[PDB]
Amino acid sequence: QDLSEALKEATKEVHIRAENSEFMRNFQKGQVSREGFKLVMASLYHIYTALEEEIERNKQNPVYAPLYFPEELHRRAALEQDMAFWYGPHWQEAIPYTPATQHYVKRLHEVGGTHPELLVAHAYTRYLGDLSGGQVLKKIAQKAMALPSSGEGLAFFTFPSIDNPTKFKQLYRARMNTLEMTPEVKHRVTEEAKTAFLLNIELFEELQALLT
Ligand code: HEM
Ligand SMILES: [C-]#N
Numbered sequence: 001q002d003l004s005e006a007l008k009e010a011t012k013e014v015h016i017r018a019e020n021s022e023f024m025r026n027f028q029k030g031q032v033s034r035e036g037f038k039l040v041m042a043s044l045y046h047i048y049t050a051l052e053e054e055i056e057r058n059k060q061n062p063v064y065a066p067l068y069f070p071e072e073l074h075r076r077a078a079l080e081q082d083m084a085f086w087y088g089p090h091w092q093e094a095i096p097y098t099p100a101t102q103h104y105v106k107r108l109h110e111v112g113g114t115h116p117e118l119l120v121a122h123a124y125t126r127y128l129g130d131l132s133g134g135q136v137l138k139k140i141a142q143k144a145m146a147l148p149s150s151g152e153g154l155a156f157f158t159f160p161s162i163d164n165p166t167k168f169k170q171l172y173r174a175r176m177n178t179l180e181m182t183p184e185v186k187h188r189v190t191e192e193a194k195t196a197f198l199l200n201i202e203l204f205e206e207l208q209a210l211l212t
Contacts, residue, residue: 002177003177003179007124007190010190010191017197018204021204022204023204023208024204026208030143032145035211036207036211037086039098039210040204041156042083043101045082045083045095046097046101047108048079050104050105050108051122052074052075054109054112055074057113062180063116063120063179064116064117064120066175066178066179067176072159072168073123073162079155082153082154098207100203103199108122115192118192120176121192122193124196125197125200128172131159131162131165135157135165138158141157
C-alpha cells in the first residue's frame, strides 16, 4: 500500500473529529472574531517556525528530502507578515505562546532531531491540510472579518508559488510514495500522523477554552 494511501486511510477518522472540533465548527459557521483568529495564527506561527526549522535541519536527509518544497509550501515568512498585520510592528513580544502550542513545538523538535524519518508525517498533516480545508477556511475568514482580496492578514492561506493546489497535492502524494519505505517506517509514520492530528485537536480545544 502506497504511503499516501496509507496516511489518508490512517487519518480519515481523526480528520472527521478534527474538522468537527468546536473551534472549527464555529469557524466554519462563520463565527470567528479578531481575538480568536489572532490566537490561532500566532500559535501557527510558532508551530510552522518549529516545523520548518526541522525541515531545514533535515533537508538533505533522504528520509525527507523528496518532500523539500520551501518555495511552494513554507509558511513562516507568510506568518511573519500576518503577525505584523494583526499584532503590529512589535508583534515579536506581543504574540502569545500557549501551553498546547509549546507541546506541539516540543514534539516537532523531538521528531526533527531524533526521529527524522517521521518528519514527513508532520509536513503531510499541516501542508496538505493548508491546501485543502485551509482554502475553505480562508474564504470564511475573509467574509467574516472583512479582509481584503489583496491578501493582507491572510498571507498564511496564500500560496503564490502554487498555481493549482489540487495538482500540487497529487504531486506531493506521488513524491511521498518515492520515500524509502519499510513496514517499520510506514507503520510509525502513519502513527505519527495520527499524533499530529491530535496535537492540532488539543490546540483548538485549548484556544476555544481560552476564548470562552
Ligand atoms: C476546518 C475544518 C476542516 C475542513 C473544512 C477540512 C476539509 C478537508 C477536505 C475537503 C479535504 C480533502 C482534499 C483532498 O482530497 O485533496 C481535506 C484533507 C486534509 N485535511 Fe482537512 N479539513 C479541516 C480540518 C483539518 C485539520 C484541523 C487538519 C490537521 C491539521 C486537516 C488536515 C488535512 C490533511 C492532512 C488532508 C489531506 C488528506 C489526504 O489527502 O491524504 N484538516 N480536508
Ligand atoms: C484541511 N484543512
